[PDB]
Amino acid sequence: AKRTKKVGIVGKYGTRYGASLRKMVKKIEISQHAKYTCSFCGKTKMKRRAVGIWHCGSCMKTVAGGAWTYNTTSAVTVKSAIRRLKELKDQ
Amino acid sequence: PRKIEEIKDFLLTARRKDAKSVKIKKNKDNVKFKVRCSRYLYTLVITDKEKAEKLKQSLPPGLAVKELK
Amino acid sequence: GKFMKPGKVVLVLAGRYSGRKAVIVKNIDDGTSDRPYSHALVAGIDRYPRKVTAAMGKKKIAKRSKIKSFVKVYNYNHLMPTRYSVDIPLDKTVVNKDVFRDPALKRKARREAKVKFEERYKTGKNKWFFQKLRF
């Protein structure tokens, strides 16, 4: 059964810290505790070990990722930019 | 302590230069021959009372013997 | 098509002889009642001949050129096949699957592969076979 209407994971904090801060931290709490599909082995096991450190329990690979998400939008953009500059550099 | 299974191995143990004595212990179910060597007390457990007497004669001459009670 | 044939050089992947190079003597792709899986009888170099150089004397070269061989039956999954083939004629009357019954025949089987390998080693042919894999 649905146990809360809107707090969800930030129901652990009760009434404290304010609705907007709890609303903000809810987005991060879901993402930083999610299990992502590993791109090396395909199993949904990519889990955060520390801030910025993501580890897959199946293939044992470790990845330098984002603080709360597996990869950041900034890092994804930079990889494409570095890929494009590499082609032009050697044509 | 080490436990000896066969009579031959006990006799070899009883003839060792470091063997110091042999104790005979008589129980209700077995007779135990224990030879005090340098490191271990070796024990032969015999369930046949007849074999115990045959073995008791076969012990080396010089080796001191004690019957426990 | 099929390639696990006699003379094929294979790498032992599992067991006491992992990383040793061997040669298929007899291949059984369909298995048997004793070994339902696919297996081959192989002969292999337990100990490789040592490196020899012109600075070494005749008697030292002969000492370093002695090979210790092994004879084994292997599951196909425990072998890595290679593109190399090695055509030493190994007497099959002595090197066969019946040598695993008594060590007297197994000693002859290993003696047979020892002599044939050493003779083939000294010719300089099949150099890759007689070089240890460095992994």
Binding site: - | - | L11, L13, A14, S18, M80, R134, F135
Partner: protein
């Protein structure tokens, strides 16, 4: 019920003061101080989470008085690297060395044409 005391002057419950209860021929409970739990070796591959097999799990200074057979496995790298990663290194070493011959041959052929 009988209540226990330490048999040494370390009155504190530290990692080196662990005990187990033992009944004696005198029919009493005393403390026996246990030895720390030893660990089997970790594979040198740095990848496999499990520990190795065929090796005694003892404190590191106990290995000195064990025979060699108790501290390794009859296999290349045995007792230091897992079986799974020894199979991988054999294939990797062989397969990579073949590609060097493949790449070298193409380079020689290209130079031959050039």
């Amino acid at each position: 019920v009988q209540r226990l005391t330490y048999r040494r002057r370390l009155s504190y419950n530290t990692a080196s003061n662990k005990t187990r209860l033992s009944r004696t021929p005198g029919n009493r409970i005393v403390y026996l101080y246990t030895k720390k739990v030893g660990k089997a070796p970790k594979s040198a591959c740095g990848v496999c989470p499990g520990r190795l097999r065929g090796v005694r799990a003892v404190r590191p200074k106990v290995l000195m008085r064990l025979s060699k057979t108790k501290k390794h496995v009859s296999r290349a790298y045995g007792g230091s690297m897992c079986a799974k990663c020894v199979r991988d290194r054999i294939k990797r070493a062989f397969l990579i060395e073949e590609q060097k011959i493949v790449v070298k041959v193409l380079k020689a052929q290209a130079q031959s044409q050039k």
